[PDB]
Design a protein around this ligand. Sequence first.
Ligand SMILES: CC(C)n1ncc2c(C(=O)Nc3ccc4nn(C)cc4c3)cc(C3CC3)nc21
Ligand SMILES: CC(C)n1ncc2c(C(=O)Nc3ccc4nn(C)cc4c3)cc(C3CC3)nc21
Ligand SMILES: C[S@@+](CC[C@H](N)C(=O)[O-])C[C@H]1O[C@@H](n2cnc3c(N)ncnc32)[C@H](O)[C@@H]1O
Ligand SMILES: C[S@@+](CC[C@H](N)C(=O)[O-])C[C@H]1O[C@@H](n2cnc3c(N)ncnc32)[C@H](O)[C@@H]1O
Ligand SMILES: [Cl-]
Ligand SMILES: [Cl-]
Ligand SMILES: [Cl-]
Ligand SMILES: [Cl-]
Ligand SMILES: [Cl-]
Ligand SMILES: [Cl-]
Ligand SMILES: [Cl-]
Ligand SMILES: [Cl-]
Lengths: 382, 382
Amino acid sequence: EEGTFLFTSESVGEGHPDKICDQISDAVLDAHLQQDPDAKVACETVAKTGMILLAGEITSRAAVDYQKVVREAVKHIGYDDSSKGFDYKTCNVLVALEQQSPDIAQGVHLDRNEEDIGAGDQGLMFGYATDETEECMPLTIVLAHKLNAKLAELRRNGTLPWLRPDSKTQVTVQYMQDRGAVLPIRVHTIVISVQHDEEVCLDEMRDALKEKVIKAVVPAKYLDEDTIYHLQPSGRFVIGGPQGDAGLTGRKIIVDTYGGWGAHGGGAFSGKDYTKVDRSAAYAARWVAKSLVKGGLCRRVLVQVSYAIGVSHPLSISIFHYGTSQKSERELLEIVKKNFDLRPGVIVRDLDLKKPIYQRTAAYGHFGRDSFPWEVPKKLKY
Amino acid sequence: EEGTFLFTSESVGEGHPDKICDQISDAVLDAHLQQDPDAKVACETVAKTGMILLAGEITSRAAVDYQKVVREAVKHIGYDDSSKGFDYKTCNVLVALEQQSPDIAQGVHLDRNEEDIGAGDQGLMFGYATDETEECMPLTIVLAHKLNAKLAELRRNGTLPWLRPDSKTQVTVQYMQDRGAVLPIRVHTIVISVQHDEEVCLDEMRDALKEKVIKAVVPAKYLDEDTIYHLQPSGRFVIGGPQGDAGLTGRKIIVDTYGGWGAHGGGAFSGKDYTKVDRSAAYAARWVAKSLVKGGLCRRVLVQVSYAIGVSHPLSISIFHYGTSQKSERELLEIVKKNFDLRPGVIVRDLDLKKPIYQRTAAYGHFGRDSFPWEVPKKLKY
Ligand SMILES: CC(C)n1ncc2c(C(=O)Nc3ccc4nn(C)cc4c3)cc(C3CC3)nc21
Ligand SMILES: CC(C)n1ncc2c(C(=O)Nc3ccc4nn(C)cc4c3)cc(C3CC3)nc21
Ligand SMILES: C[S@@+](CC[C@H](N)C(=O)[O-])C[C@H]1O[C@@H](n2cnc3c(N)ncnc32)[C@H](O)[C@@H]1O
Ligand SMILES: C[S@@+](CC[C@H](N)C(=O)[O-])C[C@H]1O[C@@H](n2cnc3c(N)ncnc32)[C@H](O)[C@@H]1O
Ligand SMILES: [Cl-]
Ligand SMILES: [Cl-]
Ligand SMILES: [Cl-]
Ligand SMILES: [Cl-]
Ligand SMILES: [Cl-]
Ligand SMILES: [Cl-]
Ligand SMILES: [Cl-]
Ligand SMILES: [Cl-]
């Protein structure tokens, strides 16, 4: 049919080595915020065979047991034995952490009123919302996330005990163009790759991934005789987690956001306190986009903001409504300016960004779940 | 004026700690390809005070002196003394490199005809082109890159000897909407932050950044009395490079591509051989997008592709022309299918991706310069 197109998004499981790093970075952030709500945290994680390395800058009054925080995060993910390729009990935890650069500290937050704190860096950030789901997220990324959540569920409840924590999923949806909005028609292609034990055969895994994972997640109305299934397409995935592939914090920024929809400014979320606008301004921009769609001002919208290090107010704000509003982009920009204050020192109050809830964000995407403050739309006056 | 909007892009200098990691990762890739054109390389770099760590997976017949390759890359960037916060002569180089997972190797390339090699991973990748510049790149990212190149030029020629290698730039352009294409009107805001010595005062630096950097890069026709300048907005940037901020490979993926324009699938380029579609398919998608614009089929275009690990052919191809073609998106998709083969085993031939030219790509963006093979448009038959 004319007016239709394919769009592909991916997601990864909690044991994906990049996602291990995100969760550890946010476990460290949460440990600091639990004792010091004003902790300055820039914690990068690196994961390879037998190694978690923490690298970065933390200035905090907190007393944090990095060995305990890191190992407890790896335990939760499910890497608890050499047979699985990684073990929280016996892995190396290396720490290369120093205080925040005093040059950054003096430029950003020292002797500044909290509301008037400088952005922790320059950068650009986008928020996106789409009416194609209730949670205002693209169906492609929602389904990809849910397939990884289903794998973790069936691993943890023991129904597929051959599963290991490292997984990736990919969903291609055929969409109908609808006056600048998008309507999902069908699932065109699904990929699932998941780490597994040496006992289970490829046919058992492929049958289980179709019958127990895909059918348990993707509504039958989206699946048909033409839907393509790439299930364990590598043929073998015994070696996995950090052993199979080095992981780093902030290497899943598209999985973390909109699955390639909307736009991205390049900033990583995990391991960063609210003064890092890479996180706080991206959460705020999601909040603005979702408020515009839930407020009925547009079906689809993209918000861009940008900052300079040491400057409170955004340098630029931009609204792109994909032709899905009766109001002009200028009118929507004026509504945003009347209703939102995107200084990081105000966002922290509105979104409660000193609360140690960050490890919860670091798998299955930061947006479209659990009614986090940035997912509760603001009632707009105009 | 109605029909106008702001768009912001950033770039970073060669000494930005994330960009140090990209250049080292690609220095390592090039060293392998110089001896073994079929080297399988997945080299992550981590940079913090006094440390370069290599982490990842390399299977290669090459004999590579990692100490020499890493230190020569850091020397070229200009970190050659403790006074600058980092020194190629005396820094720690740690190596955590293993062979490629045999499970990946058997699934992707072992006993496979080169043309029919599997994608090295699943994933999605985008190519973008815009007629707003001759090189088919957004003006925002082009200017941001050139400001960092100008800083490196004036550091290396000794005209601003107080400059250090770590820099960031950000350019906001006011655009006119033109039937789905974009026309730059003016530069709204410029940010420049650059690491400097203890001798030079803030006023000298700000004067020099305006008169010797901005006026040397940005045409006067884009600058006016209302243009906003944030020059050394932190007030002090003596501590810099890895000492100021931990760096990782693949944490500048938006700087590497379109500066937030177009779209991104999440994949990092640097440290990866052609079998990693994160790089090869993104280069190929840029090549397709630039061929469509230079072929006169559209003013602006976005290409999405996606892959499954172990599968040669893309799972999905999608064309979005922003309403800037007389041809439908379906017709452009058919032209792409007739003219391009986006198997990684064919892209490697068309774009010469075994050639050790990758360190050249790892600063100032991978697209819109130096007539790399993916920047030479293909003559289209239709
Ligand atoms: C920048 C990326 C993420 N990005 N942002 C939007 C799109 C669309 C898109 O929205 N297409 C539509 C949707 C609705 C429509 N109504 N009408 C009348 C025409 C329409 C066209 C498509 C792609 C494919 C992957 C290239 N990417 C997009
Ligand atoms: C997904 C991001 C990177 N993305 N992709 C396109 C845009 C545009 C955009 O192209 N707007 C235009 C351009 C030309 C036009 N002609 N007509 C008649 C209407 C038009 C609207 C704007 C923004 C701002 C930052 C929110 N982001 C965009
Ligand atoms: C394919 S690996 C990336 C390439 C790898 N660094 C290399 O050396 O070729 C990327 C991700 O795919 C998954 N993966 C690892 N081994 C795999 C296998 N044998 N089959 C399928 N997916 C695998 C893991 O989630 C891993 O983080
Ligand atoms: C601001 S730092 C990121 C935050 C940092 N990790 C922290 O602990 O707060 C990000 C980048 O900004 C630049 N930067 C470092 N120190 C700076 C300073 N004093 N002023 C301005 N920019 C600086 C460097 O390019 C660095 O990689
Ligand atoms: Cl940065
Ligand atoms: Cl979920
Ligand atoms: Cl990877
Ligand atoms: Cl409306
Ligand atoms: Cl990956
Ligand atoms: Cl340049
Ligand atoms: Cl950063
Ligand atoms: Cl045309």
